[PDB]
Design a protein. Sequence first.
Lengths: 82, 82, 375, 375, 160, 126, 74
Amino acid sequence: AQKDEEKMEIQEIQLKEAKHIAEDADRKYEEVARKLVIIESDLERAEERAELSEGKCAELEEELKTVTNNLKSLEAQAEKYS
Amino acid sequence: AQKDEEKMEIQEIQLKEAKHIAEDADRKYEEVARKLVIIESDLERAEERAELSEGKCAELEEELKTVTNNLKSLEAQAEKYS
Amino acid sequence: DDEETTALVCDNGSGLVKAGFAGDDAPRAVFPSIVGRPRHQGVMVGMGQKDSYVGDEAQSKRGILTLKYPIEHGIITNWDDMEKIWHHTFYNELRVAPEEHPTLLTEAPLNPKANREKMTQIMFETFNVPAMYVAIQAVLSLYASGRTTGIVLDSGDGVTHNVPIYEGYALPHAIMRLDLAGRDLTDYLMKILTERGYSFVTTAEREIVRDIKEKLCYVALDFENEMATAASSSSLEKSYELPDGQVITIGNERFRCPETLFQPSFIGMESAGIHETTYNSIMKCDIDIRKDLYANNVLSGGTTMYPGIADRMQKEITALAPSTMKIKIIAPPERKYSVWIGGSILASLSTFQQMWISKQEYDEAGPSIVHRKCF
Amino acid sequence: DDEETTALVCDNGSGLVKAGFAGDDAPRAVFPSIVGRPRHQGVMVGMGQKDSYVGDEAQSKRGILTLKYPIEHGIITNWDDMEKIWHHTFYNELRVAPEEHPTLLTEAPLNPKANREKMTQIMFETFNVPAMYVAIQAVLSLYASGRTTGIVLDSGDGVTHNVPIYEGYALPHAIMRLDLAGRDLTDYLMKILTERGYSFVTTAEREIVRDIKEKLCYVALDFENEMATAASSSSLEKSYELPDGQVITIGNERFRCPETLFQPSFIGMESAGIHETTYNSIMKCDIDIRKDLYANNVLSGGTTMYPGIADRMQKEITALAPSTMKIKIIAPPERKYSVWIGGSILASLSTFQQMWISKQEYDEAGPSIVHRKCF
Amino acid sequence: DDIYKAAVEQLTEEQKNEFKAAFDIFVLGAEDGCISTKELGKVMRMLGQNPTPEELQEMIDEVDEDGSGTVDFDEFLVMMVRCMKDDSKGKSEEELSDLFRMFDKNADGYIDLEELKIMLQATGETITEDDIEELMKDGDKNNDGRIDYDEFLEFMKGVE
Amino acid sequence: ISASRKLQLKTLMLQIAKQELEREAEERRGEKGRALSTRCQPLELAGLSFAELQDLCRQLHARVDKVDEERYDVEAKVTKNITEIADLNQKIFDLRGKFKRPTLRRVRISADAMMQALLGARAKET
Amino acid sequence: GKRQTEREKKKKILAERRKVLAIDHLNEDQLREKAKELWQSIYNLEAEKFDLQEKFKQQKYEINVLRNRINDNQ
Ligand SMILES: Nc1ncnc2c1ncn2[C@@H]1O[C@H](COP(=O)(O)OP(=O)(O)O)[C@@H](O)[C@H]1O
Ligand SMILES: Nc1ncnc2c1ncn2[C@@H]1O[C@H](COP(=O)(O)OP(=O)(O)O)[C@@H](O)[C@H]1O
Ligand SMILES: [Ca+2]
Ligand SMILES: [Ca+2]
Ligand SMILES: [Ca+2]
Ligand SMILES: [Mg+2]
Ligand SMILES: [Mg+2]
């Protein structure tokens, strides 16, 4: 009976410690999950902005190249006209 | 002694159950923490990409304006020669 | 707008259907003319999967479709699909019921009669329009330039035709229609890309090759010099990113694809290039209007948008033509929609308002009315 | 609930049978699929000793049984035992007679026909269900993610298969089925544990090795660095208490057991790992849907629950794939029951309500009805 | 359960004291009258069941108005009765769609403030402008004065 | 406050909408009956000879054919509108499907049965 | 032959809603009853026309709703 009482006491101590550790871990899980959701939303917005910018830049480059080639041809024709 | 030993057995079962709960919570916590750090790095990368794309867009716009001015000059020259 | 009644200027084309109300500057809705049935099995239930995606919707789901154009060379080979395309154009891209709007289709020169008669029969029976009129695709392109003379080379995607016109009097004996166009250039580009390792076979990948052709290819001013330069330096190799990565590098395939226009022997065609069929079309005209046609050569159609074609063609014709005549090539920046702009201008005219084929006239003479006075 | 009739979403699997009524979040009863006859003699009289303990009852008396799984690799090798498992599942774990409930079994891709036909014949003759339908285990896992595209890697315990799907149209020519799964990892772990002195041989001790694998093993982000670290320090050695004491210490066996997934040469298999069969399955698809499949890679099945696999797989695919595409790996926390959740969603749909194989249809065409339109 | 909550709420608030006594009969040792993760887990393990903490947090957050993560006494009753789900399928989709189509008196595809005001004045039930403002906040999510059909479905989620 | 009064107000609004819809539908049905009665020219079946009856029957059969043609045109228009609205619903499904699927609620395991088992009859909720 | 089917179906409506009608060989009572049948057919056709008008209004409203939903979802 004495040994059983000792075991009961140590079990109670261990149970209390484990429960407190578990509750702390659950609270940390909740907070980190919220943080992850926020940062993921921010990353998605940044990605969509970058994609739009890249598309517009590519289109503008194409337009610039076209008009530049046109100007070069026109200048060559002007020299021939001279 | 017998009654206290039964109580000790119940306490031990509950203790090990709480231990399992704590271990699972710790696993979730560390996993989500690693996810958070990875997503933070990804966000930094995306922002850098967006900045580069914006710079490219600006320079292309300026070059297009220059080429348009050159085109106007060239068309005037061409009609004069005609 | 309000009361009154506006005309629908549709333009079937072959490759891009361009439509819009009469009196504007640009077509309201431009979308590829492809109808693609799905080809795989499909396991998700209730996904709302249709049996045929037409127009621009089938250019986004093209990964699991088998796109097939309903117009081969000007002529229409699959009437059900063409009817589907027209129905889509009227109801979803313009959202105007055809019961309250005249229509102005366009047709290539020298096309089979049955095609035109079936077109008018469909427009009058199925869609039940008030009145429709069919016009030759080159006269409109001459309208858009604001000229009244000139010889117009309308190199579309289906067929390239070259109609000379003087003082408003078309010369029917000098129309030179050639069946080389953008589609054959796409096929030839897809065939010469295999010389580097890139194999495109599926009917969906023909669209990717078309995009490559549009964005990279250009017409060389002098062919042999470019062939020599591309074989020594590497200043021409431009790269392009496929829809999944794996960038490709196009070497001297850049100016060899559109060179087929000036040397149709590349794809095995016998006839002469677009640089010599124009000169032949001019020489069939009378001796006193050749100077005006030389000075007012007009380019139109999509395929004439290659960077550097308005100089190669002028150089070639100047080589062929007598040294005294002045050769001028009109290449407006709005080349692609030139036919439709001309169609809008023609439909907006007051003098033209009594040339429509009214429905009661069709009821009295049948579909063969189109060949009659109302041309 | 009340009137009306609910469907039974059973999911045979191989290793854990998961079942429950349609329309819930989690399976009602999950229990190992093992049937173990006793092997010793038995001297107590009247103890009420049965001749075969199935399900979760044989995981408690496993000390004197010889457990044997009735499903080897997706296919079913012992039909009497499988019938016993189904009977237990219906009558004791759910307590609903099958005479009044439709059933929705699940089957791996590319399985023998005879297995599926025998399954439907059993369900219609022995249990006498009103109507049953067989679905591919990957489409359901795609349902559960709420997507409609994506390539799903469903690494179960019997067989790992990789079905790509786009816009609801499955691609039958790009399914890559590989027979490495959780069971082979258990056997390999049991084989490498012998390098420290621990010998597990009995079919009952395979369960203990499975528990060790579940609780301790993890997938290394980089294999060589982990092999070097575990050979110098001792920060990895985690201990575990057997069902009788005598704790054991697992060293670098922790990340060597699940590494077999990415290097199947460890267990002598020729094929490439799960990191390269996904890329091969993608590359067989068309060139225009590869970006979407890259961005929507889905993980499912039990064996994909190793801590740290969603990063190793992403690193590997990013190494293989072109640098421009974005690689994203969807790893929902409810991975294990993903197939069953998808099955519940599919059975709860109204559009799906007419796809069941009704009993009168089976009576008219025999068991070969399953290969017909009712797939 | 929620309908059972409405039926029970028609009685006295000393029934809340009786509920506290029953909760003690369950898990005697309670000290605050609020149900956190630990107490719910303990009572469910005593019963022989275990819902996940994430599900409990979602259930709590859906009713959380003050954003503190807790519940008041009436909110304690609300959270206690929210532990079961009996509002299934949300009445009917087709009938509600027909009702909303009839609501749009000008047939513009949206529900404006004037239409809702007219309908509320025609209802005859004792109402206040504060409840009208709260309903407008709940219904028109993007504050454009108009309800989308999808916004109509969201505003009618879990409504019998 | 809580959502009990909000739900009561919402149910009251739904009841008022249903009653108004029922009354409007009944009024429209009555007006439709009146209009249909007014449209058709009444029969005059007294004092008409045999030849007059035959002539009037032939004229009314011609009128019936014309009305059949009109109703066929109306039906064809209705069929075209049905096809168009079905295609619009298809496009709605395409643009609004994907991840916009509602889900049921079966994740919560039985709770009242445990309450009755561990409480006898002390739980009267369910 | 969808157009041919349409024309033949219109002819079949002409010859079916109005069968081969021989009102010259019927007695006075039969003629009166057939005239009342034709009048009731007119009534039924008008009723179905009004029903189709109601359906057309409902279809227009639902099409507008779908258009608004499409525009907002983008
Ligand atoms: N910017 C461009 N550069 C080169 N080729 C082009 C360009 N745009 C269109 N094309 C070619 O022209 C075709 C479209 O021609 P289009 O004028 O639309 O034909 P249609 O006369 O039938 O309308 C496309 O198939 C494409 O191959
Ligand atoms: N938490 C876990 N960690 C690692 N492996 C696991 C875990 N849970 C299950 N497994 C492995 O997955 C298998 C169960 O897979 P499961 O998805 O049930 O297969 P099936 O597809 O036949 O249902 C088990 O045999 C086990 O080896
Ligand atoms: Ca609160
Ligand atoms: Ca309104
Ligand atoms: Ca709104
Ligand atoms: Mg054209
Ligand atoms: Mg499985």
